Amino acid sequence: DAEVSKWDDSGNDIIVLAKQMCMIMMEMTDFTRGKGPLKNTSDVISAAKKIAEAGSRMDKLGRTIADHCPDSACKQDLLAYLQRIALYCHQLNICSKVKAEVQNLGGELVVSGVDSAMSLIQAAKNLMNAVVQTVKASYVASTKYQKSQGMASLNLPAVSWKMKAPEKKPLVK
Amino acid sequence: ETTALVCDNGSGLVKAGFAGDDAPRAVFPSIVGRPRHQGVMVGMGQKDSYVGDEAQSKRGILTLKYPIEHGIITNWDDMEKIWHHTFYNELRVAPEEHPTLLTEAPLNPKANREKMTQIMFETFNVPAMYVAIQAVLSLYASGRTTGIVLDSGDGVTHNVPIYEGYALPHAIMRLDLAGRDLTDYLMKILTERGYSFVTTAEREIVRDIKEKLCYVALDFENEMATAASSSSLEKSYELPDGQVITIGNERFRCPETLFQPSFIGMESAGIHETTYNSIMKCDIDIRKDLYANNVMSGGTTMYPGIADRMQKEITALAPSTMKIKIIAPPERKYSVWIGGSILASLSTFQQMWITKQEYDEAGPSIVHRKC
Amino acid sequence: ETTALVCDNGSGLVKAGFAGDDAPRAVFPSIVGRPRHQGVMVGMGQKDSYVGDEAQSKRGILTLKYPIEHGIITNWDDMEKIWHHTFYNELRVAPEEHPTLLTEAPLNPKANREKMTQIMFETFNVPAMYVAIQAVLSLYASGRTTGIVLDSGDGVTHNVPIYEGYALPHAIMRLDLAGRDLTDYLMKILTERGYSFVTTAEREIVRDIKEKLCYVALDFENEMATAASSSSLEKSYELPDGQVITIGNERFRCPETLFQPSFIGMESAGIHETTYNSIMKCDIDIRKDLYANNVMSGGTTMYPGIADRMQKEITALAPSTMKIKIIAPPERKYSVWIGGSILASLSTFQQMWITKQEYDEAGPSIVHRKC
Amino acid sequence: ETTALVCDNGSGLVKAGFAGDDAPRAVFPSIVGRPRHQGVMVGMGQKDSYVGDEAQSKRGILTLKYPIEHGIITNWDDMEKIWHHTFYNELRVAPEEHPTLLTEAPLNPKANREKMTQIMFETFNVPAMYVAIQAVLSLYASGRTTGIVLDSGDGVTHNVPIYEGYALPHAIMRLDLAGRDLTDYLMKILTERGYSFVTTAEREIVRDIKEKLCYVALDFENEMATAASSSSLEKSYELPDGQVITIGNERFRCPETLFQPSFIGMESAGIHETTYNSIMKCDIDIRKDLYANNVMSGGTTMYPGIADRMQKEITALAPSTMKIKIIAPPERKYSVWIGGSILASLSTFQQMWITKQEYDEAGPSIVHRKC
Ligand SMILES: Nc1ncnc2c1ncn2[C@@H]1O[C@H](COP(=O)(O)OP(=O)(O)O)[C@@H](O)[C@H]1O
Ligand SMILES: Nc1ncnc2c1ncn2[C@@H]1O[C@H](COP(=O)(O)OP(=O)(O)O)[C@@H](O)[C@H]1O
Ligand SMILES: Nc1ncnc2c1ncn2[C@@H]1O[C@H](COP(=O)(O)OP(=O)(O)O)[C@@H](O)[C@H]1O
Ligand SMILES: [Mg+2]
Ligand SMILES: [Mg+2]
Ligand SMILES: [Mg+2]
Numbered sequence A: 001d002a003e004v005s006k007w008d009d010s011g012n013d014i015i016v017l018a019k020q021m022c023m024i025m026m027e028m029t030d031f032t033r034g035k036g037p038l039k040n041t042s043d044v045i046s047a048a049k050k051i052a053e054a055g056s057r058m059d060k061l062g063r064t065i066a067d068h069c070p071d072s073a074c075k076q077d078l079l080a081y082l083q084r085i086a087l088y089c090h091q092l093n094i095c096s097k098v099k100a101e102v103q104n105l106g107g108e109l110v111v112s113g114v115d116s117a118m119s120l121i122q123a124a125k126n127l128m129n130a131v132v133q134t135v136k137a138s139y140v141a142s143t144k145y146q147k148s149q150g151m152a153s154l155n156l157p158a159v160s161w162k163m164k165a166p167e168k169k170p171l172v173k
Numbered sequence B, C, D: 001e002t003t004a005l006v007c008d009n010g011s012g013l014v015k016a017g018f019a020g021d022d023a024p025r026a027v028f029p030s031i032v033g034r035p036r037h038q039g040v041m042v043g044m045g046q047k048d049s050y051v052g053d054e055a056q057s058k059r060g061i062l063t064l065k066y067p068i069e070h071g072i073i074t075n076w077d078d079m080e081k082i083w084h085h086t087f088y089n090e091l092r093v094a095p096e097e098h099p100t101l102l103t104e105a106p107l108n109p110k111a112n113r114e115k116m117t118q119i120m121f122e123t124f125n126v127p128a129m130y131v132a133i134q135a136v137l138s139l140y141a142s143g144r145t146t147g148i149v150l151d152s153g154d155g156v157t158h159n160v161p162i163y164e165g166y167a168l169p170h171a172i173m174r175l176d177l178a179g180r181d182l183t184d185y186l187m188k189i190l191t192e193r194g195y196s197f198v199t200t201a202e203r204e205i206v207r208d209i210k211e212k213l214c215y216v217a218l219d220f221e222n223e224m225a226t227a228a229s230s231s232s233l234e235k236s237y238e239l240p241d242g243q244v245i246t247i248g249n250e251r252f253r254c255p256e257t258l259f260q261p262s263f264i265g266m267e268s269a270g271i272h273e274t275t276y277n278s279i280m281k282c283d284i285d286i287r288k289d290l291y292a293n294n295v296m297s298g299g300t301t302m303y304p305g306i307a308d309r310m311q312k313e314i315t316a317l318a319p320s321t322m323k324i325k326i327i328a329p330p331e332r333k334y335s336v337w338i339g340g341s342i343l344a345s346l347s348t349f350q351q352m353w354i355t356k357q358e359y360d361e362a363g364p365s366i367v368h369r370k371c
Helices: A013-032 A041-054 A058-066 A076-082 A084-105 A118-129 A132-143 B080-089 B113-122 B180-192 B203-210 B220-229 B284-292 B306-315 B335-343 B366-370 C079-089 C113-122 C134-140 C180-192 C203-210 C220-229 C287-291 C306-314 C335-344 C366-370 D079-089 D113-122 D134-140 D180-192 D205-210 D220-229 D287-291 D306-314 D332-344
Strands: B013-016 B026-029 B032-035 B062-065 B100-104 B128-133 B147-152 B157-163 B173-175 B235-238 B244-247 B294-297 C014-016 C026-028 C032-035 C062-065 C100-104 C128-133 C147-152 C157-163 C173-175 C235-238 C244-247 C294-297 D014-016 D026-028 D032-035 D062-065 D100-104 D128-133 D147-152 D157-163 D173-175 D235-238 D244-247 D294-297
Touching: A013 A041, A013 A058, A013 A118, A013 A132, A041 A084, A041 A118, A058 A076, A058 A084, A058 A132, A076 A084, A076 A132, A084 A118, A084 C335, A118 A132, A132 B080, B013 B080, B026 B080, B080 B113, B100 B113, B100 B335, B113 B128, B113 B366, B128 B366, B147 B284, B157 B284, B180 B203, B284 B294, B294 B306, B294 B335, C014 C079, C026 C079, C079 C113, C100 C113, C100 C134, C100 C335, C113 C128, C113 C366, C128 C134, C128 C335, C128 C366, C134 C147, C134 C157, C134 C294, C134 C335, C147 C287, C157 C287, C180 C203, C294 C306, D014 D079, D014 D332, D026 D079, D079 D113, D100 D113, D100 D134, D100 D332, D113 D128, D128 D134, D128 D332, D134 D147, D134 D157, D134 D294, D134 D332, D147 D287, D157 D287, D180 D205, D294 D306, D294 D332
Parallel strands: B100 B128, B147 B294, C100 C128, C147 C294, D100 D128, D147 D294
Antiparallel strands: B013 B026, B032 B062, B147 B157, B157 B173, B235 B244, C014 C026, C032 C062, C147 C157, C157 C173, C235 C244, D014 D026, D032 D062, D147 D157, D157 D173, D235 D244
């Protein structure tokens, strides 16, 4: 959503990685209305194999923080979202090879753009919605346990995460 | 520098933010939902608790519980999950460097603020803490020092009469009938038309009905005579699956139990003659200043026509020469919070916190002497 | 290293292959034919069972039996011949070094998967095993985690409603009407024109008729009025012996029993108000996400016009504000296998196998706990 | 002289008779079956509806519908056929000269008794009428005026707490899990052994299974451990065609959903902490007189061992000094009728009927005021 747009590009490794994945997802989102650089189905398959690789690197970066936490009572909200991005990229790898062979065997007339490439957008919207919870669950585990030995070796202060305080709620209406 | 936190943790809703502002930064429901179905996909699981706003988009597979019932915290393990959610996950602050101002209803058990003063110090490690009464904070948000405060929330309602900054503790009345007991009456009253809402995720749908279609009639036994002669009051509401329900005279019979609590089997009096019985327990010299300053706070006091109805009923009880003015601000849902950001950002208040070293000489009984 | 096998042993067709791929390496029919005639030449004989593909090139001297009827394995000595055929003779692997992922319909007998566990461990000696549900694997292969899956195969059709990886087992419906009961209805409906197919080897000819000429009419009572007024719907088919048959209104009367099962004497409702009566047994919050994610799987859902007919019949039952999207992929015959290659090649799945060491401390009743 | 009729028209069974007797004169099932097959013989036809007892001898060619589902009459043309059958064809009376006492569940729609009043006056032309609640008439039949009545029927179960002839309507709880939802759980639970019952005429065979072999375990997690260690719990039942089925631990897993309603997918609590949660909503002075007088009524409360199980589960919730006595009479299936014959034959009751003269100044809305 617009929460990723509120983050700054000069952050640490996880913020600059989750900013690139929302730029790929924004190229597949407007393809449902046809206002993006991806013109036909054959570019959506190349982008879905790209967001499944960048999303497979935050499983690596997210597990360098999950093992440095001292007790097992705080990483339960972090490993629960690291196992969801293990599934959503395995679907994006295999259901892009499947839709490449259907496009190759039956031709280009079998795929229709919209309502045919929606099996890759729906599996990528669920990857992005489970990777902004992986940023937020890793921001908590990096500042709640900052002074412990092991977490400071990653060099992740609270100022490196460029997330601001939220807006004021409306009083009336 | 070191701006204080103000966490007004009522029943039903949690409002938090920074002291000195005019609006809360975090308003989310106070529910902790756990899944009740069987998970088939691997990975979809290992997350056995959803707190706040993410347990209402994902209701329909969860069982929603409230940790605070009737103003009293009943589940002390699900209440720590909400305080952990409103500091790190919602406000994105660190509690080790901000003092927090909590908020409690009057006439509560003394082991309810004796455990709030233990969790904030020994688990969240705040530098300072203070527990304030709800209806004394909704007088700061009106610009008054005198008045009588009807604070109708989700768990309890209470009247606190205050004159010149001096509270009268013998005239503080408290009802346990509030906005949650109007939802559970609306589920029972809607079975007369066929709609049966049962589950804990279906009580959030009938709660969103009463926030949109319910209103207080100015004369109940006249409005019940025009709801039967015609269909001029029936309004339609669309359920989450697309079904359209139609509600007639159940629109004003639901907030009428605040004025006639015999509908739900309670013996006590309505909110119009429990705010008059607490006026008549004050001194005679200050009753003229409480009749004119009648502050209404809380979210349950936001029905369309609850100020025009309540002014009609206290006028019929008070003597005919006293003028009666009911002050209902348009922002009265957040009045308990706005006075919390006024009190915690004061210059005189900064010597009244309960510091962490003061918690070491005493026990958790320090909060009874300083608050 | 040690790539898993994914053997979807459905009725009527066996699809096997390796986990992590995108297409099965082995698709052959699930028949075991035995010769019924008298062998005169010495040498032709001493071979009393043909399995799979060579029992259809050599039919006409064989009687063809199906070991799995209605999703339940009826012949346990002929099912071992198909598993022996699909490992050694068809996939050319050794089962002693590959773990296999079997596949079963919901609401089957518990002694059906208790004997698949006993056979793979005590006869084929696999290192690990797992038995999955069919309609949960056709959501893996569809890019979703929420949705309702109509999986129409050869023995059974079943609906499994799933919301965010959480299944609702009280809303799982199952019909025994499937594709093999449309072959036996086409044999009876073709006798009105004179063509009489009788034998077990003549049922594979009328099965190839319905895969080529049968379709689903969008309006049945209008299509029967234009099938009799003109002859624009008739199409010809050539038998294996050179004869040409002509089929008129039996092209759409054969797949119409999925929507009107009173043609075969069944009392059950169609597949358009079985997929709706299982949505309306789910909770009200998740019904908007099951109307829009309506996955169709299996081979019997491949008639021309079964998606445009089914959108017509749920929009006549669902409320008028819900939008209904039916997801019919072009490769929906192999959807149950592709989600089996997804699940077995998963990084987090590799602790959910039923290992051979686990099979010794329990009996064959371990498959009920772990699956 | 002009002895009144008492028609307890429950879901699943209709009990009728004369007021003042000790037993009903007419007990027949509440089904209206219509033929679904093709009639070939001339004369054997022209009869499109069988009601009551001859729609169970002639089932197997019929489709059996229930006009009352969950205590609410869904089919108003099929319900006129059962009232016409129970007056003329079964009781052999003329309804123009007998006043009838109908019977309704609590917390029903208000247009349910507004159409029983319209049909009994404008079609059957009775001189007088009265509609009573079910669970108050099962206190007349026990010789009590105080107590709490669990009335488990076929559509609904409900608790009505009554102290000295004064009912507490804020503590009346109502479930929709009843005996018909244990038949539909027995159909699903029996597919694990191979037996599949599908049709509406096959749901009456699995209903006769649970009336003969089903019982309530005293300790469920111990009985499930001795049902698997041996075969001392299995009992055989013979189908109408001579086939013998064998049922093991499905004898006590079917009535266990009354105490654990999470089996059939419902969220709400069991019947042991619904009859306790409605005790704890009454006044504290009358709770000692409701723990000792615990009336159990209806047909679903007739499993062998539901009284010894329910005393085990309320004494684990109630305080340790209150003694708990559960009063299950041996004739508790007809308790709602016997109190109907007690009330309608009373000397004081004879001015509380709704006469046909009173029906003319009002509409059908007179039944809400006089009942
Ligand atoms: N606009 C409204 N109209 C009527 N009732 C309302 C409205 N908004 C909220 N309510 C009721 O009042 C409650 C809000 O009270 P609130 O002050 O948020 O409670 P708390 O003291 O627990 O924070 C809602 O849960 C609902 O029952
Ligand atoms: N084009 C088609 N039109 C109609 N039915 C088809 C078509 N192709 C295959 N079928 C049917 O699909 C079934 C086989 O596909 P599948 O669902 O994989 O079978 P199974 O589930 O028994 O393994 C058979 O009943 C066959 O008649
Ligand atoms: N011996 C029994 N054991 C269990 N259930 C029974 C028994 N006898 C009758 N029932 C159940 O009781 C119900 C019918 O009795 P009753 O309570 O009078 O029905 P209703 O309230 O629908 O008129 C059915 O659900 C039936 O299965
Ligand atoms: Mg409040
Ligand atoms: Mg299949
Ligand atoms: Mg009854």
